[PDB]
Amino acid sequence: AHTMETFSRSENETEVKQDVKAGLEGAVKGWGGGATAGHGNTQGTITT
Amino acid sequence: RELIVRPDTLRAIINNRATIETTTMEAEFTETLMESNYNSASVKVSAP
């Protein structure tokens, strides 16, 4: 009797994040103002 | 239809080497992709 068993497994995982933020403000003689902006990006990957 | 005449005997050899063979193969594959975004904007204006 002869038995042969072979097993292989590969797991790969990847994650990327990227956040950007910006802002502005100012006022003269009470004529005020402000602004703000943002951006995001998240990418994941799982391979088995 | 019978092509040849029935013989009185047969030439034979004996072989009793029994064999059992089993093969199993399994394969799996998984692939997950994830993405996400966000955008933000804020604005403000002022006066007295």
Short mmCIF file of C-alpha atoms in Angstrom, two decimals:
data_model
loop_
_atom_site.label_atom_id
_atom_site.label_comp_id
_atom_site.label_asym_id
_atom_site.label_seq_id
_atom_site.Cartn_x
_atom_site.Cartn_y
_atom_site.Cartn_z
CA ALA A 1 0.00 0.00 0.00
CA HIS A 2 1.25 3.48 -0.85
CA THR A 3 -0.44 6.78 -0.01
CA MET A 4 0.77 10.25 -1.02
CA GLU A 5 -0.95 13.48 0.04
CA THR A 6 0.19 16.96 -0.96
CA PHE A 7 -1.33 20.24 0.22
CA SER A 8 -0.63 23.86 -0.68
CA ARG A 9 -2.22 27.12 0.44
CA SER A 10 -1.47 30.76 -0.40
CA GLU A 11 -3.04 33.77 1.31
CA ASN A 12 -2.30 37.33 0.21
CA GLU A 13 -3.83 40.45 1.72
CA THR A 14 -3.26 44.09 0.80
CA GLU A 15 -4.64 47.38 2.08
CA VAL A 16 -4.04 50.99 1.01
CA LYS A 17 -5.45 54.14 2.60
CA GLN A 18 -5.05 57.77 1.60
CA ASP A 19 -6.74 60.74 3.30
CA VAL A 20 -6.31 64.37 2.22
CA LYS A 21 -7.74 67.37 4.06
CA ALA A 22 -7.50 71.12 3.51
CA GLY A 23 -8.94 74.27 5.02
CA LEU A 24 -8.97 78.04 4.71
CA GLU A 25 -10.37 80.91 6.76
CA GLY A 26 -10.21 84.68 7.01
CA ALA A 27 -12.08 87.84 7.90
CA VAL A 28 -11.69 91.59 7.42
CA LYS A 29 -14.01 94.23 8.91
CA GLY A 30 -16.33 91.41 9.95
CA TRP A 31 -16.68 90.16 6.36
CA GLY A 32 -15.66 86.67 7.38
CA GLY A 33 -15.39 83.42 5.52
CA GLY A 34 -14.10 79.88 5.61
CA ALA A 35 -13.73 76.82 3.42
CA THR A 36 -12.80 73.16 3.85
CA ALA A 37 -12.23 70.16 1.60
CA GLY A 38 -11.50 66.47 1.97
CA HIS A 39 -10.81 63.31 0.02
CA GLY A 40 -10.37 59.64 0.83
CA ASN A 41 -9.33 56.44 -0.91
CA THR A 42 -9.22 52.92 0.56
CA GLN A 43 -8.40 49.84 -1.54
CA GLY A 44 -8.27 46.30 -0.17
CA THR A 45 -7.46 42.94 -1.74
CA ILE A 46 -7.66 39.34 -0.46
CA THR A 47 -6.46 36.46 -2.64
CA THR A 48 -6.59 32.85 -1.46
CA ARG B 1 -21.11 -14.20 -36.94
CA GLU B 2 -18.48 -16.67 -35.78
CA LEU B 3 -15.31 -16.00 -37.76
CA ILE B 4 -13.14 -18.89 -36.57
CA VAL B 5 -13.80 -22.51 -35.69
CA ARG B 6 -14.28 -23.30 -32.02
CA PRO B 7 -10.93 -24.57 -30.70
CA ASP B 8 -10.45 -27.60 -28.50
CA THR B 9 -8.34 -25.61 -26.02
CA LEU B 10 -6.94 -22.16 -25.33
CA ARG B 11 -3.39 -20.94 -24.75
CA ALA B 12 -3.39 -18.90 -21.55
CA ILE B 13 -1.19 -17.52 -18.80
CA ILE B 14 -2.23 -16.68 -15.25
CA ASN B 15 -1.94 -13.18 -13.79
CA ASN B 16 -3.63 -12.30 -10.49
CA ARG B 17 -1.81 -9.08 -9.55
CA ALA B 18 -4.80 -7.02 -8.50
CA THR B 19 -4.40 -3.25 -8.27
CA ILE B 20 -6.53 -0.50 -6.74
CA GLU B 21 -5.71 3.13 -7.50
CA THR B 22 -7.54 6.21 -6.21
CA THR B 23 -6.69 9.83 -7.03
CA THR B 24 -8.38 12.89 -5.52
CA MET B 25 -7.63 16.49 -6.49
CA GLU B 26 -9.18 19.59 -4.94
CA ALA B 27 -8.53 23.21 -5.87
CA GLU B 28 -9.97 26.40 -4.39
CA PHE B 29 -9.52 30.04 -5.30
CA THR B 30 -10.99 33.17 -3.71
CA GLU B 31 -10.49 36.81 -4.66
CA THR B 32 -11.98 39.75 -2.74
CA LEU B 33 -11.67 43.37 -3.89
CA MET B 34 -12.70 46.37 -1.80
CA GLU B 35 -12.74 50.07 -2.66
CA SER B 36 -14.13 53.17 -0.99
CA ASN B 37 -14.07 56.93 -1.46
CA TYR B 38 -15.29 60.01 0.34
CA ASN B 39 -15.35 63.67 -0.65
CA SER B 40 -16.20 66.58 1.63
CA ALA B 41 -16.61 70.30 1.06
CA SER B 42 -17.65 73.01 3.51
CA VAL B 43 -18.13 76.70 2.74
CA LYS B 44 -19.04 79.65 4.94
CA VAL B 45 -19.53 83.34 4.20
CA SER B 46 -20.06 86.10 6.72
CA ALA B 47 -20.86 89.80 7.09
CA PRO B 48 -22.22 91.96 9.95
#
